[PDB]
Amino acid sequence: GRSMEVTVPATLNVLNGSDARLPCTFNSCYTVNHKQFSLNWTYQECNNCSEEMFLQFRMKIINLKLERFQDRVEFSGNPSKYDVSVMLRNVQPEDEGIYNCYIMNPPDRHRGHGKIHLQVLM
Amino acid sequence: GCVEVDSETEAVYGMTFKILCISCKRRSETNAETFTEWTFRQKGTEEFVKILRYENEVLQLEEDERFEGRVVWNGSRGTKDLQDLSIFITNVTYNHSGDYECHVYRLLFFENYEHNTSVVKKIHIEVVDKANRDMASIVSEIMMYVLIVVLTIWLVAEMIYCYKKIAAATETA
Amino acid sequence: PVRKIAIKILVHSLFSMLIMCTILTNCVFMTLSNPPDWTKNVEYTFTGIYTFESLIKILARGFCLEDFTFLRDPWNWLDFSVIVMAYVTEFVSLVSALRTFRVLRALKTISVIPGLKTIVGALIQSVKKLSDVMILTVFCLSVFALIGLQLFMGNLRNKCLQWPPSFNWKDYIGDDSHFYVLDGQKDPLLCGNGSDAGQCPEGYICVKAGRNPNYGYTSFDTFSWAFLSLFRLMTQDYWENLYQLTLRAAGKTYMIFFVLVIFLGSFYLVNLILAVVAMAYEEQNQATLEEADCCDAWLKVKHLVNLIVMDPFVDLAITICIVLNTLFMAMEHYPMTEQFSSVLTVGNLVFTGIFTAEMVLKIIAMDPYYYFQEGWNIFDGIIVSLSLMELGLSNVEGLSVLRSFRLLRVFKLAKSWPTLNMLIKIIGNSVGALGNLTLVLAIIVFIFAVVGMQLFGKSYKECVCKINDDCTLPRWHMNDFFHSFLIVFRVLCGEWIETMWDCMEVAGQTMCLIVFMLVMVIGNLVVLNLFLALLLSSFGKIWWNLRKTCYSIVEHNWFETFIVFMILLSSGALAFEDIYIEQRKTIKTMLEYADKVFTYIFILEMLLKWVAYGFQTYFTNAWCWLDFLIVDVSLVSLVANALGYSELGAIKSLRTLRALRPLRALSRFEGMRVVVNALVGAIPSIMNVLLVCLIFWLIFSIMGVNLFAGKFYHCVNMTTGNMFDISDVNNLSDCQALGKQARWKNVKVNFDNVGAGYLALLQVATFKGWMDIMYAAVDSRDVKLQPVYEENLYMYLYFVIFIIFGSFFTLNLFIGVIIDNFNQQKKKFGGQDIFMTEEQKKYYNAMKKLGSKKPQKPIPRPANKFQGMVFDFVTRQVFDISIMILICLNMVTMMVETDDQGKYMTLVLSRINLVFIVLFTGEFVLKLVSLRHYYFTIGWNIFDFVVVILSIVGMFLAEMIEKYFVSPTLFRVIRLARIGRILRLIKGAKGIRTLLFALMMSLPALFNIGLLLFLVMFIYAIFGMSNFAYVKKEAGIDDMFNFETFGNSMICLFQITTSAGWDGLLAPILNSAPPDCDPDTIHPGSSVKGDCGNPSVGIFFFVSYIIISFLVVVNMYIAVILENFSVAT
Ligand SMILES: CCN1C[C@]2(COC)CC[C@H](OC)[C@@]34[C@@H]5C[C@]6(O)[C@@H](OC)C[C@@](OC(C)=O)([C@H]5[C@@H]6C(=O)c5ccc(OC)cc5)[C@@H]([C@@H](OC)[C@H]23)[C@@H]14
Ligand SMILES: *[C@@H]1O[C@H](CO)[C@@H](O[C@@H]2O[C@H](CO)[C@@H](O[C@@H]3O[C@H](CO)[C@@H](O)[C@H](O)[C@@H]3O)[C@H](O)[C@H]2NC(C)=O)[C@H](O)[C@H]1NC(C)=O
Ligand SMILES: *[C@@H]1O[C@H](CO)[C@@H](O[C@@H]2O[C@H](CO)[C@@H](O)[C@H](O)[C@H]2NC(C)=O)[C@H](O)[C@H]1NC(C)=O
Ligand SMILES: *[C@@H]1O[C@H](CO)[C@@H](O)[C@H](O)[C@H]1NC(C)=O
Ligand SMILES: *[C@@H]1O[C@H](CO)[C@@H](O)[C@H](O)[C@H]1NC(C)=O
């Protein structure tokens, strides 16, 4: 194969203060199991600097409570239906950046990538 | 494949005998490590004293005088999966005529499930001095001869009856 | 005035050609799996051209603002729909819409040339007569599937589970590591509890707990899966696997089910379908036929060349040269050494030189282009030019494939060979007069290939790791067009379900079911129609006194029946020569002496025939010769055994000839004798056409040898049994350096020489064995080189072409000559209904009158009571249809049955069955109150009476079994009264009635041919028991389906009779030497050694049985088909 077809829009902007739904939904043939499924979320403000991780799914959901932005992230998806979008609270002007969803659903061998530009529109 | 046959019931004095114990695996392709205890009881004796032990390749025997240097192995050689447990008793005497037990212990290998199965084969032998031919062979031979003779008699009776009839039919002209 | 401009353009010839070429290039573009970005503009050009065409049609079939213009024709709807859906898809965010018009745009190809519409219409009107045949097919499929549903209910899910060495029973069943996988099968082994069923390995117990055997799809638990499995059985697609799984789960004693369906559903329903399609096509054909200096030098050289011999050695010498060239090409093999490869090369050079000399001698005498007029001259010129090009090149990579083109010179024999000329005529006729049908078939195959590709490409690519363990594409996928075409072609050849399982597991059960059944129906119907079209477009003082007594004794019926009985006894005495005879040890000696009895009695019988007939009149008879030879073999065996020459190789091999003892039944059984006579009468024409087939297959075998010649050699990782990759081992120098872990294994069915090529072509044309052959051929790179997965991916086309020619046109010629020979034979007989003796002919022509009868209204009125109105109400068609509705509802509520249903659900089903039973008994008692006088005008009332009695009895024993000593294996069998209760549908099922009556009328000839087939099976099963009872337990021969016992030999032979699994059953016997087997492997309790079968005797056994069974099945097919024709026409 080539990759995993992940249905994520190019960009989406939320009004300030209101709750934001960060989308990460994939369309995989394989019936996902909660023992081998791998997922992670990455946030970037650079162009060519090191990247840090803040949300993982490995046999269970893990929120590391990243100290940079906030504890705003929350699990609001459902892996069994191949939609693992997350919940974001208290959107602030410092939240603008690029967010990347990394997916690895056994027995597939392709790491699905989803890019989104987290901006704010009036 | 392999079949389980019953060992011959009687042996003959002075000659050799082959006691069989064929514990064929229920599934042929399953790998196994088979060893076996051979024991027996004398006629009129109520016990079971181990006489020998067969392992991967080597056969071990006790200090029993009834088989000291007069028994050899005739099972499967060089396989580690015996599936045949045969004792060849050379120079059969009146020492050994009783009830043999063949305790075949098979460690069957699998994916990650080693099974440890035990099967017991009991065979009764009774050494005699004259080789008595089996009753089935005698009855079959007698029946063969009787059938041949009676069918020849039937054939000649029909031939002579037809000869008389054809004579009566042909002397008319 | 306004539409006059767009009327001339419509009917203009170049506009039709424009539509032609745009459709053709659109079809070429759909071939691409992942087209580049620039093809989208080309698709825009295509749809613009289609819109331009539709605008022309709109401006031509409507005047003064007309809305619907081209709405009175079928294909115009297709064009409008595809254009609309092309413009509907313009909204990208509308998707599952690309796979909606692209599978519909492919249907535009049907209108590729004006004229295919007539062929499609003819096919549609021809499949219209199949209504009764298909309703009977679905009726029998449902009845047999209900039988399988009540017998094998959840049996296929039996799996050997290990005894718990410790969620309890909930996380133990669903572990899949606690079952038994058969050492590289990725599926738990099916098992059983009763005898003659699957034997659990020591430490395992058989439990009805698992998913299913094959991806969840081959099972009897639900009537839908039962219907699928029995459609599989009826089409004989890979049914040997279902055969083995079902007989391992339920037991070997259930094969009687298959013996019925394979004879009733798989054999007879196919015969009905073929007969009625032939009937429809005969009707269409009959309807169509009834409705329709320098000049001096030139002259002297012409005098020199033309004025030569004509008959003496100018056209016979050329034929001899062609035959010698064919023999030289066939002499090629591998590994061929020098001073023979050089000999073959110089022979080829001499032959091409002499052919050039002949061509120049002919052209300088015929002055082209007058030489290029007769067709054969053009063909000779083309082939000799190809030979010159190939000899001038001698290095053409990578298509030296044209080197085999010289084999076409063999077809120059067609000038003198009438049968080869007929085969060439048929081949040319298919591309000529039946060119329309050939193009329809090609277009339909292409359309199905592209539909499968568009529907399942991304699926087979992303879902792939569900059907493959390496998560890579399988051998047969629809990701790209070539593989999609290969799958569609394999579906036509017969193997649909093996890829339909993967299709279900990848891209939707319902979608793949619909796609594959549409393919299996349409493409197979098109192939059958093309085959039928090609088939039909081909045309003493004491001495004499004792002699009378002996003659009378021999001809006496007493002696005759005594001899028949004792022949049967002697034949059956052979079936006890199992591998268990040594454990029997008493019937062993009983049979040892019975053999002496039988041979003495047969010697006496032979001497009586002698002294009654005379040596001349005895050795004149072929049957007497056969009996005399068998008696001589038995006598030599007896003499050797008596003298002590028993433990010798020659005598032991001659003892195997004891399997010929059942042959004495040929002269005794009348139906068997007449069937053998009918076969021998047709054997001359069959032999001539088989020689034609041998020549054609020899051409194909030499081509295959040229292509492969030992490229099938590969390195198997000796520790696991799988092929090495080229990343580790690339060539023979490396598979001889790995050492002990590398074996350089062969395929054992390859194209190394012409004999092995014949074997491989036989496997390919029988369609059971072609799998590994094509795999190795496609993988092959070159001589002494490790194969690569689909390195020569396009060598699939070789075998495709073979199946097209040597398996299809060759089969057409064979069938045509059989029809012609049987037509002439039955016209000579007087004369009709061969394969029948005199008693069976009397039965047949009395049964004809019995079936051709009508009721003589013998139901006047009851006798003076309310039974008058009871009769007036019962006799009505409303009641006669209400009873059928109740029967249909009973059939439906049985279909509702499913494995592991609830206790409440089972109780509800029992109550519904009780209600149906009481209503049926009420109907019976109403008919009784009506016609107590007789009630027995026709046998249908008696059938209803007996079936209702049997249903009551079955219910009573079911209750008894539940209330007392219980056994499911008998409860399931005794719950089969429901089958007869629904078989009562034939009472009202007209058409089905006459088809079953045709079957019941053809039963006598079918029984005679079946008796001959059973005798052949008995002889070959005894041969198997003698030879292959100790071969290795490889692919086709396992612990249950082998040649150890008479039952196992007969189940294997019944499997082979339908040509199924003979490749697998031959694979372990082809092994000759280590490391494939062990020549001295002692196994108790038998004195025999070695687990390797002799390849020569194995090939002889299997090929001879395949040929004999093919002849017997063709005879059965023709008997049923001619019976149907005589009944209907
Ligand atoms: C006689 C065997 N043989 C020869 C023929 C005839 O040559 C002109 C050509 C080659 C083709 O393959 C080898 C055939 C078909 C492929 C198929 O898969 C196959 O399986 C091994 C068996 C067949 O059928 C049956 C009942 O033997 C179908 C069946 C199929 O496709 C089908 C079956 C039933 C059906 O309607 C209920 C629709 C389609 C046969 C013939 O046609 C009846 C046809 C089979
Ligand atoms: C074939 O015969 C064997 C021999 O008995 C059958 O094995 C039996 O299987 C049943 C269940 O299938 C066992 O019942 C028990 O069920 C409870 C749950 O209710 C569970 O906790 C137990 O561990 C066990 O599974 C039964 O014990 C078991 N028999 C023996 C002796 O262990 C088998 O079911 C038969 N299969 C068929 C298809 O006939
Ligand atoms: C057979 O294959 C081997 C390797 O599988 C060839 O040996 C060398 O392989 C390396 C691969 O890393 C190549 O780079 C070399 O060019 C190969 N050697 C030569 C001389 O070309 C080997 O050549 C192949 N052929 C034979 C006859 O052994
Ligand atoms: C039994 O063992 C003897 C050795 O004492 C050997 O000669 C003989 O061949 C063996 N018999 C069998 C059947 O193995
Ligand atoms: C058996 O052993 C006895 C011991 O004395 C000996 O006399 C006899 O000859 C032996 N017989 C055979 C056959 O070895």
Ligand SMILES: *[C@@H]1O[C@H](CO)[C@@H](O)[C@H](O)[C@H]1NC(C)=O
């Ligand atoms: C038989 O048994 C007796 C008593 O155990 C022993 O003394 C004798 O030596 C045995 N026979 C032979 C031949 O050894």
Ligand SMILES: *[C@@H]1O[C@H](CO)[C@@H](O)[C@H](O)[C@H]1NC(C)=O
């Ligand atoms: C179990 O296997 C061991 C060897 O690992 C063996 O010693 C023991 O006898 C076996 N158990 C029984 C009951 O035989």
Ligand SMILES: *[C@@H]1O[C@H](CO)[C@@H](O)[C@H](O)[C@H]1NC(C)=O
């Ligand atoms: C054969 O396969 C096994 C496991 O798949 C592997 O360990 C071994 O190395 C292979 N053999 C060779 C010669 O590489």
